[PDB]
Ligand SMILES: O=C(O)c1ccc(-c2ccccc2)cc1O
């Protein structure tokens with residue numbers, strides 16, 4: 001069968017919150033079958049757990065924030081993108097502060113840390129949500145949709161009227177049967193604009209942001225001295241963000257997601273509409289990993 005996965009070993013990392021600028025210690029720990037991904041604020045006494053489920057998303061301004069009352073875990077989406085990409089079902093994520101560390105602004109450091117510690121296959125079938133019917137949410141000129149697809153594919157379009165985006169790829173499709181999440185999505189970095197930073201900092205956003213963890217765009221150029229990792233890095237990062245936001249479903253998807261200028265808010269609205277629309281999906285398992293329409297890397 002396709003088996004549930006957790007970590008083989010405890011993983012530790014240090015960094016700072018993109019939005020808070022706060023130093024934070026991150027610990028990834030194995031968890032039992034059917035735990036899901038559960039975040040834990042170990043700086044609080046008592047410790048507070050918040051499961052990484054759509055119902056616990058409380059703010060979607062410029063990241064996906066898990067909230068339980070006054071307790072927040074901000075910017076979960078890059079780490080959840082890495083776990084979706086590697087097929088991690090079950091993990092405890094301990095944080096000493098209210099925000100996941102940004103690392104280099106991508107999922108690269110997370111996929112590296114997880115594959116270094118290794119994956120553990122668990123003796124329980126991995127459960128997928130298979131899309132049986134179209135489910136779409138729109139708001140103004142933004143759209144997010146699921147459609148039936150025998151596999152997992154993401155299509156995304158952005159549309160920035162900024163000179164740095166002019167002539168540059170603003171649409172991409174990634175079929176995970178034919179493309180590596182690690183090689184083609186994980187290393188795409190968060191990007192920000194100089195023209196925004198004064199307003200964003202007034203909102204306690206991007207307080208930890210710099211060229212060390214973000215692509216910074218000025219009037220007519222990328223400021224990062226080493227430039228882009230991909231010509232299409234911006235749209236590849238929105239695909240990374242979508243895979244992380246959509247992993248708050250709690251299970252991997254069998255279907256296609258298309259995003260049209262959609263961000264954390266509409267992605268979460270699409271999850272909530274899908275969960276309510278039970279005739280549009282079913283849970284499926286695969287008794288033979290070799291015959292399944294999706295494959296994960298050897299653990
Ligand atoms: O969203 C982000 O990821 C982000 C990152 C960095 C900056 C930033 C940092 C320093 C100067 C200018 C912009 C702004 C941002 O919105």
Ligand SMILES: [Zn+2]
Nearest residue numbers: 078190237241
């Ligand atoms: Zn992001």
